[PDB]
Each structure stands twice: as structure tokens, then as C-alpha cells.
Design a protein around this nucleic acid. Structure first.
Ligand code: MG
Length: 97
DNA sequence: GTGAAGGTTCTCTTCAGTATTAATAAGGCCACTGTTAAAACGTACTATATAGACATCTCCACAAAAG
């Protein structure tokens, strides 16, 4: 019925091969998204090599629930003015969830 | 004494006695009981002070399903 009423979360394998800072191949990361079902903002993400795990879920949840701050190395013109807790959380059946 | 031997009386004794204060006692053998300390000595209803065979809960490690 309103914003934050149901957040939704899932993970997927990003389709970019990453590299170490020394330049050698690192297998693709996983991306986790937390999404407002009303508003349809993306509320927060976690991007990393760690497989789908409750610590990864918790890491996306932290970013989503908390206010956002980014420095000038992020050349943003907008601002990611979204925060606050969900009232419900809607997921698939993964063992992390 | 000029010395020795011998003569003589002297009374009455109805008066004196009878009372306490009394010392622990002053008996010794025998045998035979029956108390009287008090010493020696079997064993009970207890009050504890352990020592250690067991039972228990807890923490950590392995096979089945979903994305
Ligand atoms: Mg999923």
C-alpha cells in the first residue's frame, strides 16, 4: 500500500569478469539488490565475490536501511535520498533467505 | 651429893561425815558378714569426616535440498 511496505531481495551473478588490481582474472561477482515494491526505487545493493549468504543478505540490508553518503569520487549529480526499514521482506527460498 | 632410876598427870573428842567441775578411752583376739571407695574393664547409641564408583550436560563436528 505504500513505500517500504514490502521490500524485495535477490542475488545474481554479474556478467562481467573482474580482475585483481594486478590485472589477473577474477571470476564474476554476485550482485544483491534490495528494492521498494511501491516506488520501485532500488533501495540498496551489495556487490562482491561472496556467494549468496546470510552475511551478504545482511550486508545489502545494512546499505538499504541506512542513509546513503558518497564522496566526490562518486561524481553524482543526484542523491540517493532513500532509507528506513521495510515493514515486510519478500524473497525466494534460498538457504540464505 | 651430883647423878641415876623411877613416878606422875594431862581433862573432852554428840564429832565428822555425806554434794560438785569430771575426762576419748583404758578389749583382744578369732571368724564371719556387709558395707564402701574406687579401681579395672567389657561394648553401645551415636556424630561425624571422609573417599570415589557413577550419571549428566555441554561444545564441537558430519549429509540432504535450494539458488
Ligand atoms: Mg534468487
Amino acid at each position: 500500500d505504500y513505500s517500504n511496505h514490502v521490500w524485495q531481495c535477490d542475488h545474481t551473478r554479474v556478467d562481467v569478469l573482474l580482475v585483481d588490481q594486478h590485472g589477473e582474472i577474477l571470476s564474476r561477482p554476485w550482485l544483491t539488490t534490495v528494492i521498494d515494491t511501491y516506488s520501485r526505487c532500488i533501495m540498496g545493493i551489495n556487490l562482491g565475490f561472496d556467494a549468496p549468504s546470510s552475511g551478504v543478505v545482511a550486508l545489502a540490508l545494512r546499505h538499504a536501511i541506512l542513509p546513503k553518503r558518497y564522496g566526490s569520487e562518486y561524481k553524482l549529480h543526484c542523491e540517493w535520498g532513500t532509507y528506513g526499514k521495510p515493514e515486510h521482506f519478500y524473497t525466494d527460498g534460498g538457504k540464505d533467505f
